């Protein structure tokens, strides 16, 4: 298989991670998706200790606890699995950690979770943090740099990606350290559109295209995949892969990215 890196986000609240492994290319048998993203664990805030911390809702916890059936099989077949981390309406977000030490403690929780569950990486989605709730501060310009630097240091050989949205995504440089190069990938969060991420990464690691499989018209899915290849971009994002038969939708972009339509087990 040769072509852009395919990524699929799965809202584990309602869907199975395994669905991502169901699609392969008719010509070649390669995976239609190269990366699967568990959406989403989150950044919580303890008002008492005034400390942010990593939280997994029951659904996220359930899939992590069942890594052998929910995650391991995807990895066995060559698909990378990442844990997305999202804001949780509690004031704490990736852009408002008060210090280097504070950001670093949270990065350890992340890297520890990655090792414990045998994950391939982390995805940062700075949305719904609601900076300010519970007496918290507004995003500052060192928090994210500190968090990314620590995480990357913690897991040098794993994946770290950026869902391109929010205060954090605009605060990649501080004190002479630009954290753009510590990210493996970055992508557009707006389904049905082409929006090149601002983060200073080369085309090969960016996905200006974004589609919500089953919702975006197969014409637009095909168009964005076509533009991806034509403009030389190296990633393509599919959001909300569900349990329905989306072979036609997956084929809409695989024909363009890989030259083969897809098959679903
Ligand atoms: Zn809210």
From Swiss-Prot:
Domain GH18: 4-260
Enzymatic reactions: an N(4)-(oligosaccharide-(1->3)-[oligosaccharide-(1->6)]-beta-D-Man-(1->4)-beta-D-GlcNAc-(1->4)-alpha-D-GlcNAc)-L-asparaginyl-[protein] + H2O = an oligosaccharide-(1->3)-[oligosaccharide-(1->6)]-beta-D-Man-(1->4)-D-GlcNAc + N(4)-(N-acetyl-beta-D-glucosaminyl)-L-asparaginyl-[protein]
Record keyword Repressor present: no
Assigned EC number: 3.2.1.96
GO biological process: carbohydrate metabolic process
UniProt keyword annotations, A-Z: Glycosidase, Hydrolase, Signal
Active site per the UniProt annotation: 127
Single Gene Ontology MF annotation: mannosyl-glycoprotein endo-beta-N-acetylglucosaminidase activity
Gene Ontology cellular component terms for the protein in this record: extracellular region
Superkingdom, natural source: Bacteria
Disulfide-linked positions: none
Cited function: Cleaves asparagine-linked oligomannose and hybrid, but not complex, oligosaccharides from glycoproteins.
Family of this protein: Belongs to the glycosyl hydrolase 18 family.
Record's protein name: Endo-beta-N-acetylglucosaminidase H
